[PDB]
Amino acid sequence: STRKAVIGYYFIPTNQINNYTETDTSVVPFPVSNITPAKAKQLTHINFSFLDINSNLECAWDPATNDAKARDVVNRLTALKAHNPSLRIMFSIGGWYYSNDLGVSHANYVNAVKTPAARTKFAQSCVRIMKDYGFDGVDIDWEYPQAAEVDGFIAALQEIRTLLNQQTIADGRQALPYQLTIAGAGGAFFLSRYYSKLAQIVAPLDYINLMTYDLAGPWEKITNHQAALFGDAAGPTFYNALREANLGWSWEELTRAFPSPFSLTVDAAVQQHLMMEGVPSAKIVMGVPFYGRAFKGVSGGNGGQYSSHSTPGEDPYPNADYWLVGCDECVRDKDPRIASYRQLEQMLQGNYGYQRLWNDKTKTPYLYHAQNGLFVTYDDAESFKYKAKYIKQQQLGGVMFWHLGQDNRNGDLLAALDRYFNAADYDDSQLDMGTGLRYTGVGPGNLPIMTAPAYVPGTTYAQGALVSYQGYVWQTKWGYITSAPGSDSAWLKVGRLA
Fold this sequence. Notes:
Elements lengths: L4 E7 L2 H5 L18 H6 L2 E9 L5 E2 L6 H13 L8 E7 L1 H4 L6 H7 L3 H18 L3 E5 L8 H22 L7 E7 L2 H4 L6 H5 L4 E5 L39 H7 L8 H9 L9 E6 L1 E5 L32 H5 L5 E3 H9 L4 E6 L4 E6 L4 E4 L3 H13 L4 E5 L9 H11 L43 E4 L2 E5 L14 E6 L2
Parallel strand pairs: 1-2, 1-14, 2-4, 4-5, 5-6, 6-7, 7-8, 8-14
Antiparallel strand pairs: 2-3, 9-10, 9-13, 11-12, 12-13, 15-16, 16-17
């Protein structure tokens, strides 16, 4: 009955910091004053974003940042702690723009973690920045260290953890200790970069916040839900890259863990984490998007789902055709491919030609514009009922979302998440989780409780026979077997004794 984490990003670009104002939404659309006391009480963490790693290989603000203005913005966030003694203002280092393989600062990430001396200088800079600006913990969003850089990343996280723990003691902060989190991959292709060492990555963290969204987008040929909870057999499937990770597992072990192809869903990412030994459910946080992804040039037949499309994938958006009818924020941001939940509500409400439809397998909503051939995948307070029930059922740590400025003006999405976890009068015991496709993989970290007859020496066991032995349930891979389970390759450990 530990409180579920509710971790919301506060993203503010450098130009908005430098021109910070709370009275002109054309300059700063989402100032700190829009985070009311009521919203502050519903959050456990705000991730202030983004800081970077500079060419000196230290955590640093964008050098174009006006420091006085930056401190003013952060001070406004930390003042919110007055409303909620559990609230932390984290800061996030990285993000896609800075840290992707082709990002402007990518080499600084690689180099900062490369050697013990670099790791010390980097780790010290993270805690120095945390203390100088008054933040409550460090969140690292490197998207993503490659398999070869992973050992350095692990050591960097370990070293930051030690320094944060020292700082908690120095400041008498045992009631609200300084924390360390990362934004983790929420799909198997990026996850495969560091998957084999997942337990080492998670060990120094309070949470790993899964980016379980952007699972569809203009870079894929076929439209799809970007954050389906469960799978739809009518939707696309994907190769399971995890089966090629350097795990040292056998064919049967790999096959049971990593069905391929599979449905790229939130459940898949969560289960992929739980399959690894040493990765506790309580540290896994489910990311949800407060925005939708829009596609144009879609066909009818299934409400724009699973259709080819003509949505540019380039950055920046390559022309001035802002084709997402009714999306005023898209004109402001010169990109019709992403729309906040705040804007999507208005688009539904106005005379713009959208239908709201629901996929009861994926448990997510979508908009379809039949006249122009548009499809929008997004999440809302209804999809969040299923995701919140899943968080509770699977004993996850909580929820994370990008970003606070995209909730509607009344903060309905954040209020819904808070309600589903904390409201005494909310009852989801009868909420039907549907017949969407579950990720069926089992690994060492999530063996089901089972029972079976005790193993008997001398007995000749056929293929598929189940026995209990030395604390586990085992299945023969072929027949006929007479060896003791665990003594050779013939037995698969399939379950654990209660």
